[PDB]
Structure formats: C-alpha cells, structure tokens
Ligand binder design. Structure first.
Ligand code: SF4
Ligand code: ZN
Lengths: 107, 431, 143, 66
C-alpha cells in the first residue's frame, strides 16, 4: 500500500550518506573512486556469467534451440533461480550508470 | 622489410661525442575510421531468451547455402524442408548442428569423448545423422547444407556436405612508402617474471625512439600505430588488481607520448563477461587521458587503417573452439572460423553473449584484408585465397609473458615479421 | 668540456658506487640519448687505454636480423662483456651497436638495471619525449 | 473488437515470423518486415487505431513467470 509512494533517495556508494544530486561518490570519499569502480564491476562480471549458464540449460532440457521455453516446474531448482538473476542484473546494471558512459555511441 | 632497412646507413655510436645528433618525425596517420559500431551497445536490456538469436541466424544464413549447393551439386536441385522428406529419396537439407556430447558440465584440457552424436535441427524438428561425416571436427552452432536420404530407422545417411564460405572483398589502394603496424598481446602486469619487465622496457624503449642507432631510429619512426590486444593484467587468483592499473596507466602514458595507441579488453580485464565487450572506463587512468593519442576500444574490433581494413579479437572464440573440437593448430582454427562465415559459432552454448534479437552481428558481411587473433601460445602467419579474387592474411599474435615476441605488419607488401626481446639472464658459461 | 663529464662520471661510478645507464646519465646531465652513449664510450676508452686493469665492467647492446627456420626475425639483446663476439657471429645482418651500462662490482642477473631506469622515471614524469629522437606533433596534452 | 483479438492471437503463434515471447508485438512486426518474410497489412492496421493498451500491444504470455 504505502510501498508505491516512494521517494527513491540516492546514496553514496562509499559511506552510505543520503544526499541531493545523482552522482555516485561522496565529496569526502571522491579520490578513492577508481577503486570503488573497480569494486562492483567484478560483481557485475559474475552475475553476467550466471545468467548465461542458466538460461541456456532450459534449452537443452526442453529439446529445442529454436522455440520458446515453457516449463514452470515447481520441483525444478532451475525455475525461480532463473527468475531472480534477471533482477540482480537489472539492479547491478543500473548502479554502474551512476558513473558516466565509457565513450560515445552515436558516431 | 624492416631489419633490411635498419642497416641501410652508417654507424656513428661507437665514437666520442659530436656536435649534432640526428632527430626525426613520426609519420602521419592521415586516414583512420572506426567501424565497430554493431559491437558498441548503448541500451543493454536483458530479460530476453536465447531463442531469438538462432532463428535470425538461420533466416540470414539460408540463401548463401542454397546458392552454394546449387553450383556445388548441380542446378537440378532437390532442396527440401525437414518434414517433407519421403523415405529413400535424394535431397539437400539446410540446417543447424547440435553436438550431443556427454562430459560437458551442467550446473548441478579437452572435452571431446569417443562417443557423441550429431543432430541436424531446424525450427520445427530434429533428425540424427550418420554416414560419411566428421564426428569430432565439428561443433554445435554451425549452419550447413547436406546431401542424402531418410532411411528406415528414422536416421539420415549423409554423402557430402558444404559450408557457407568467404564473403566478397573489394580491393585496397596501393601505398607509396611502407608504413608498419605493431601488434602485442598479453603483457601480464601483476605476475609473470622479471625478464618480462626488462622485455617490456626494451620494447617501449625501441618504439618510442630511445634505443639503437639512426638505423633503428629511422625504422621505428615509420611505425604508424600500436595495437594492444587483450589480457593486459594476467591474474593469479581473484578470491593485486588495484596496484596494477597504476602501472598500466604509467605505461600507457609513456606510449601515448609518441605513438597513437588502441587498447582492448581481454579475458581478465575490468569489463563485462558477454562477448561484445564494452570499452574500459576512463576513471582508472588519470595520467594517460591527458593526450588525445590514447584510445580505448571494444574487444571485437574493426578498423580501416590507411585503406587496409582490420578485424580482430582477443582470442576467446579460438580457444573456445579448441575446447570442444579436435583441431590443435590455432592458425587452422582461425581459418576454419573464416570458412563457415561466423566469428564465433559456439555462442551461445559454451561461450556467453548478449541476447540480441534483431540481427546476429557475428556473421561476416564483407571480407577483411587482415584477420588476427589474440593470446595464442606461438607465432604463426599465413596467406589464404578465396574462390573469387579474395586474399586474406592470417596472423596469430603470441603471448608476451612467455615468448616476449611481437609482430610487425607491413601495409604495402602485406607481410608479417616477428620481433623478439631478450636481455641476458643469470648466465655464466664457466660452470 | 671533456673534464666536466669525465669527472662527473668518475665521481658517480667509483666513489658513490652506483650503476650508470645511459638514460640515468641523460636525465642527470640533461643530454641527448645518443650523445650520452658517446660520452660513456669516451669514458670507457680513456680509462681502458690508460690502465688496462681498472675495476670496470661493461654491458653492451646488439641488434639485428636472423633466420632460425626460414623466417626472418629481428633479435635485440643486452649482452655482457665476455660473450659479445659469438653473439655477433651468430647473427646474419648487424644493425645497432652501442653501450648500455658500466659497473664497479659484478652483478648476477639483469635485476637492478630495471630498478634504476624505473626509479629515475618515477620522479621525472612530465618528460619522456624530451630527449627522444622522434618528435610527433598530434600528441600534446588536450583532454 | 472480439474479432481483432483473435487476429493478433493468430499472428502471435505463426512460426514463420519468429520465436516471439520476450519482446513487443510491433517490434516483431517490424523485424519480419526488415527481413521481409511476409508480414500482412492488417496486424499493422489495428496497432495504429489504438493507444498504448496492454491487451493489444503485448505478447500473449506477457504475464506468466516464464
Ligand atoms: S526450469 Fe528447470 S525443469 Fe524447467 S526447463 Fe529449465 S532446467 Fe528444465
Ligand atoms: Zn561518501
């Protein structure tokens, strides 16, 4: 009920201080930013490796490589373990867009 | 080529001091164009499934294989869908392989086993395959045409089969004065020796213009570009990485002073895991981003360097094919990858990629003049011909941490020469 | 003129007991790189013609072409004082000879010859193309 | 309506336009048109006389935790 009326306060990635503006780093903890980018891209890297091992296992348990998967088997660990990594990746991809882009894209 | 011209003058340096010493200038790079835009991913939405990729791969690769099976087996054509086959009748089928291997790990060194089946699959159904076909040279994900008949046990008997082949290739303009290009891979900053340190120092000292006589300084001034291809920080164990980016920043500063440089992410480098790897973020390089001669690019990399067009990877497709096949020669695997018209056919089944849905971007749409690979254990180079007028130079770049070898590519004669660096070690010839 | 760098090298080498590469002796005295190699050859020729029995050890550099199995490679090596002529006779074409370093008491491997160049780079970071034979034009600090 | 909701349900299961349960309906219509397989000009003419309704502009199983 109340959960819809969010404010979505941003927070510093280094020391957890809520503040106005969208930049990821805090003004006291700004120098140590290359290390804080280094940290958490090795987490995105390990979530990417878990998405792909799971969503292609359903293709081999199903039989076909060219048509959709429909298997909501409640006794398979595969089901609902393939559902949460989509959201982990959704969240961890958006935390790294706090940092700018590493280049242009319209050239 | 290079070492021929490096002796073409007089030698001044075993002499007492002089009034003047010669200087030179770096040759201009008056044409360059990056055309690796299908690998730069701006939106990056997950939450699709991997079935949109196989369907567009088949739909795009089908007319090439029909048009080659016509002129390879005769225009009295018998091409037919997998469901409309009658028992014991001669026909041609165009489909996608699937290799059914045990010993491939599931969720809960080679991996080929003496028994494993091939299955030809289309969008609606599958069929098994036996006959005259290679069981261990082929991998899951190749699209091909095949000739034979449906037998009585439901299986299929194969007589001969054909691949897609090389794409068209427009000719390049010839050059006036020879320009060179240097290729290095796998420095391994973080661990791997001390002879690698003096090797890296001697390499940057030669290319920057600090070392050797006026022969070497005249010949290293003609090197137009530098390409560093993946695996810059070799890592011993993840769970070190913070102190290595400082030294990589210093080295890229000392190279960005004189030459233009292109830097590519590799197997261990701070980027994503899926195959169109995005460029490195500039916030890890404070010093080297002062100059506009340093560039950070995608792992898959195309370019047009002085008319000659380049395409390369950091050696992740070739070792993946090496895992699940029987071929050993990395130059042969690179040429085979060229022969089936796909940079990485084992994706996604054992090599992860992004879930595209509009068009598969690993199909070759044209033919490159040069086509290199990444972190291969030894040097190799070759020239191959097409059916039409298509010639391609194939280079495998060695790994600097063991061999200490780089490659020079001439842009007018189109040849490749190795360069090797070796300081003296703890060597005493009186024991 | 000559006595300036001759006395500077004679106090750097034999008194402070240091290891002098050409890049260290070009960042100390503000000299071109080739002129620094010529300076070191001048010093070693004078003090090896004077006495013949000094406490002096040299290391050179040899570069040039080679053919191992058909293919033409280009081999570059930093070599000691005993093994020069054999390395010169293994090669096919010769392309570069100069001097790399001198020592007081003999080392065991190529260890400290990287430490010296690295440390003298470490404090001198706004100039490395300053004494370089190649001066490009588009590389000036812009971004 | 109630006849336009079966035409879209028939466009969504024809195998000659693609394996589509992850994307929108108009994206799959334009994907087939690019490759030009044979999109019909009626599954377009109901996706223009409507606004952003989730029971026209969505795949059949856009619920359903698959
Ligand atoms: S969810 Fe589990 S049971 Fe269902 S297809 Fe995937 S692997 Fe098989
Ligand atoms: Zn903070």
């Amino acid at each position: 009920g109340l959960l819809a009326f969010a404010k979505r306060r941003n927070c510093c990635i280094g020391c957890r201080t809520v503040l106005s503006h969208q930049g990821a780093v805090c003004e006291f903890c700004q120098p140590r930013e290359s290390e804080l980018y280094q940290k958490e891209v090795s987490h995105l890297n390990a979530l990417e490796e878990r998405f792909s091992r799971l969503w292609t296992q359903c293709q081999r348990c199903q039989g076909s490589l060219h048509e959709d998967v429909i298997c909501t088997s409640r006794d398979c660990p595969i089901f609902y373990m393939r559902k949460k990594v989509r959201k982990d990746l959704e969240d961890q991809e958006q935390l790294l867009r706090r940092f700018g882009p590493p280049g242009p894209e319209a050239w | 080529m290079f070492s021929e011209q490096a002796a073409q003058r007089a030698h001044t340096l075993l002499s007492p001091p002089s009034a003047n010493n010669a200087t030179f200038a770096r040759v201009p790079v008056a044409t360059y164009t990056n055309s690796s835009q299908p690998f730069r991913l701006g939106e990056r939405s997950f939450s699709r499934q991997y079935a949109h990729i196989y369907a567009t791969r088949l739909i795009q690769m089908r007319p090439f294989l029909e048009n080659r099976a016509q002129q390879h087996w005769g225009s009295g054509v018998g091409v037919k869908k997998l469901c409309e086959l009658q028992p014991e009748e001669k026909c041609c089928v165009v489909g996608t392989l699937f290799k059914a291997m045990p010993l491939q790990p599931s969720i809960l060194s080679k991996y080929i086993h003496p028994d494993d089946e091939l299955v030809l699959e289309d969008e609606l159904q599958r069929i098994k395959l036996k006959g005259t076909i290679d069981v261990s040279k082929l991998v899951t994900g190749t699209v091909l045409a095949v000739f034979g008949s449906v037998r009585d046990d439901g299986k299929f008997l194969v007589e001969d089969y054909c691949f897609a082949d090389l794409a068209p290739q427009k000719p390049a303009p010839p050059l006036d004065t020879d320009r060179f290009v240097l290729l290095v891979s796998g420095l391994g900053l973080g661990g791997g020796g001390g002879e690698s340190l003096l090797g890296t120092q001697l390499l940057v000292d030669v290319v920057t213009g600090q070392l050797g006589d006026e022969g070497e300084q005249c010949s290293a001034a003609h090197v137009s570009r530098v390409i560093l291809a993946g695996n810059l920080l070799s890592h011993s164990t993840q769970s070190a990485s913070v102190e290595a980016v400082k030294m990589l920043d210093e080295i890229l500063l000392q190279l960005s002073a004189s030459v233009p440089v292109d830097v590519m992410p590799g197997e261990f480098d701070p980027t994503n895991y899926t195959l169109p790897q995005q460029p490195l973020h500039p916030c890890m390089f404070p010093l080297a981003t002062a100059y506009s001669t340093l560039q950070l690019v995608t792992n898959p990399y195309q370019a047009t360097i002085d008319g000659v067009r380049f395409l390369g990877t950091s050696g992740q497709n070739v070792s993946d094919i090496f895992r699940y096949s029987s071929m050993e020669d990395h130059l042969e695997i690179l040429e085979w990858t060229l022969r089936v018209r796909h940079i990485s056919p084992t994706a996604p089944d054992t090599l992860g990629c992004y879930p595209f849905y509009k068009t598969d971007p690993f199909i070759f749409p044209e033919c490159p003049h040069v086509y290199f690979c990444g972190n291969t254990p030894s040097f190799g180079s070759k020239i191959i011909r097409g059916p039409e007028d298509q010639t391609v130079l194939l280079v495998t770049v060695p790994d600097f941490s063991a061999t200490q070898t780089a490659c020079l590519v001439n842009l007018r004669s189109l040849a490749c020469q190795p360069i090797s660096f070796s300081g003296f070690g703890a060597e005493d010839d009186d024991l | 003129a000559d006595q300036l760098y001759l006395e500077n090298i004679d106090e750097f080498v034999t008194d402070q007991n240091k290891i002098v590469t050409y890049k260290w002796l070009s960042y100390t005295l503000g000299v071109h790189v080739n002129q620094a190699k010529q300076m070191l050859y001048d010093y070693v020729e004078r003090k090896r013609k004077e006495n013949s029995g000094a406490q002096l050890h040299v290391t050179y550099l040899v570069s040039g072409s080679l053919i191992q199995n058909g293919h033409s490679c280009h081999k570059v090596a930093v070599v000691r004082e005993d093994k020069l002529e054999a390395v010169k006779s293994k090669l096919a074409v010769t392309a570069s000879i100069h001097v790399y370093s001198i020592q007081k008491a003999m080392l065991k491997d190529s260890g400290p010859l990287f430490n010296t160049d690295y440390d003298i780079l470490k404090s001198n970071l706004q100039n490395c193309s300053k004494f370089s034979a190649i001066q490009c034009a588009a590389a000036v600090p812009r971004a | 309506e109630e006849a336009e909701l079966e035409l879209l349900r028939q466009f969504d299961l024809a195998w000659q336009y693609g394996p589509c349960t992850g994307i929108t309906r108009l994206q799959r219509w334009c994907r087939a048109k690019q490759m030009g397989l044979e999109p019909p000009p009626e599954v377009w003419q109901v996706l223009k006389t409507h606004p952003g309704d989730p029971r026209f502009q969505c795949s059949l199983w856009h619920l359903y935790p698959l």
